[PDB]
């Protein structure tokens, strides 16, 4: 990259600058530093997971559209929650969370697969060996799977943000295609209990 190895990454969160630490600060001062990239912001409203999701969604490097879509999904979710709650039906404070962000987070959590299958060849044939995935990978899987579900094409003339919202809602109380997929994966892993010894790490 056009940043040198001299240049280090910028820590942005401004609560860090509102007080070993001293030494670190000194070191930083001594050193050079990268510029702050676009999406990761100083603002209070910024959510990193959501940003990541948006990025994932983005196709042809047209970010604005993706962002808009993401916003719309959230809006849709909010609307749905309000419908559930306010005028139509009872004002069920406990069972209905209204924060869309929180809902999204919950969905993501639900979607995380605690086992994943690596393909391993032996003799001259391919076996699906179970492996414990690191958290980051799991997170990636969550979002990616969701995105693919949204894409599908079996849903046809329906717009994105609505569909995504629906999916999120489904996830929120353990339903939907993503969850099914996850369960299927788990089942597969279970089926290959015995092939955990094929793994060499």
């Amino acid at each position: 990259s056009r940043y040198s190895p001299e240049f280090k990454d910028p820590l942005i969160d401004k609560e860090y600058y509102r007080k070993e630490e001293k030494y670190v600060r000194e070191l930083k001062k001594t050193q050079l530093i990268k510029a702050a990239p676009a999406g990761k912001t100083s603002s209070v409203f910024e959510d990193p997971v959501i940003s990541k999701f948006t990025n994932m969604m983005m196709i042809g490097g047209n970010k604005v559209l993706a962002r808009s879509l993401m916003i719309q999904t959230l809006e849709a979710v909010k609307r749905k929650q309000f419908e559930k709650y306010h005028a139509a039906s009872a004002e069920e404070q406990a069972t209905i969370e209204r924060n869309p962000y929180t809902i999204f987070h919950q969905a993501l959590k639900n979607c995380e697969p605690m086992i994943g299958l690596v393909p391993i060849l032996k003799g001259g044939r391919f076996y699906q060996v179970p492996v414990p995935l690191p958290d980051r990978r799991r997170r990636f899987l969550a979002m990616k799977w969701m995105i693919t579900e949204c894409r599908d094409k079996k849903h046809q003339r329906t717009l994105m943000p609505e569909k995504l919202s629906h999916k999120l809602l489904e996830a929120f109380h353990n339903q939907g295609p993503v969850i099914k997929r996850k369960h299927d994966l788990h089942k597969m892993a279970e089926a290959n209990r015995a092939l955990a010894h094929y793994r060499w790490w």
Binding site: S1, R2, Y3, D9, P10, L11, I12, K14, Y17, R25, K28, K29, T30, L32, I33, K34, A35, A36, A38, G39, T41, S42, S43, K63, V64, R67
Partner: protein, 305 residues
């Protein structure tokens, strides 16, 4: 040596001639002037500065050698001659002696520099050994002479680029503190004028930032530095922007804004800002396309089959 001496004289003569030629009349005049003259009247214009035409005191030009390590009737002068690389060996011996003496009592060089100092060609392992020895000596706890000897090798560096250079404050028409600063990003230049006091909004080329930037990300970017500072709505700004596209322009503006803020923000805060990476010109710019490739790095397909 005789030849060198002759050349020296000749060089002097040349210099004198040059002086006579030029408007600067005295026979005593500096090297810089001479260089300038040369540039003027033998303008090469080549990019390699070593390939340009020069004339100097040839004790600067020529790489001197250790001429004559044995006198007439053989008998080499220095006692460690048959080692080869004698000077280095001698130095090592001296160091050892010093160490011994010390015991009885109770940044670094670079290889090229060392070589230059000595004259003899010197391998890496030898250099390493020497360095180790020096370190040991340093550790020892020494007298003044030893320290002096050590210093002969050790050379300073000068540490630059840590503070952000704080711009002036300025008052024009009426008594208003207004800081000028300028940022570039991705072929898009900006020039921000932050006013101290005057609470409110940002005008980009006259038009208000809300209209100039429709997109939320760009708005966020614009906000950034002020938000970081905590002084959000307390400054009005006029900003001339030029070149490039939206996002780049926004980035440039942000940079400029940050710079402006530096002018009248506490030094600690400035430092913090710098750390957080909004006072540094990102040098990421669109890569040149190559004549073997489809894009700047994407290549045409079946390279392996």
């Amino acid at each position: 040596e005789d030849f060198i001496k002759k050349q020296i004289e000749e060089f002097n003569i040349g210099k004198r001639h040059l002086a006579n030629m030029m408007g600067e009349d005295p026979e005593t005049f500096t090297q810089e002037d001479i260089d300038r003259a040369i540039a003027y009247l033998f303008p090469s214009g080549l990019f390699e500065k070593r390939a340009r035409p020069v004339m100097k005191h040839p004790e600067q030009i020529f790489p001197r050698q250790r001429a004559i390590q044995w006198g007439e009737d053989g008998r080499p002068f220095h006692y460690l001659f048959y080692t080869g690389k004698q000077s280095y060996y001698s130095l090592m011996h001296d160091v050892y002696g010093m160490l011994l003496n010390l015991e009885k009592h109770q940044r670094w060089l670079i290889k090229e520099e060392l070589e230059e100092m000595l004259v003899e060609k010197l391998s890496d392992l030898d250099y390493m050994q020497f360095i180790r020895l020096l370190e040991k000596l340093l550790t020892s706890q020494c007298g003044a002479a030893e320290e002096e000897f050590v210093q002969r090798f050790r050379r300073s560096v000068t540490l630059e680029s840590k503070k952000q250079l704080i711009e002036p404050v300025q008052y024009d028409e009426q008594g208003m503190a207004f800081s000028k600063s300028e940022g570039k990003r991705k072929t898009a230049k900006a020039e921000a004028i932050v006013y101290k006091h005057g609470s409110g909004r940002i005008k980009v080329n006259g038009i208000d930032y809300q209209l100039y930037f429709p997109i939320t990300q760009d708005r966020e970017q614009l906000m950034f530095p002020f938000h970081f500072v905590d002084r959000l709505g307390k400054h009005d700004v006029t900003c001339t922007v030029s070149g490039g596209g939206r996002s780049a322009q926004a980035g440039a503006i942000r940079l400029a804004m940050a710079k402006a803020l530096c002018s009248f923000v506490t030094e600690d805060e400035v430092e913090w800002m710098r750390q957080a990476g909004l006072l540094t010109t990102d040098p990421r710019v669109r890569e040149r396309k190559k004549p073997g490739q489809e894009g700047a790095r994407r290549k045409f397909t079946w390279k392996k089959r």
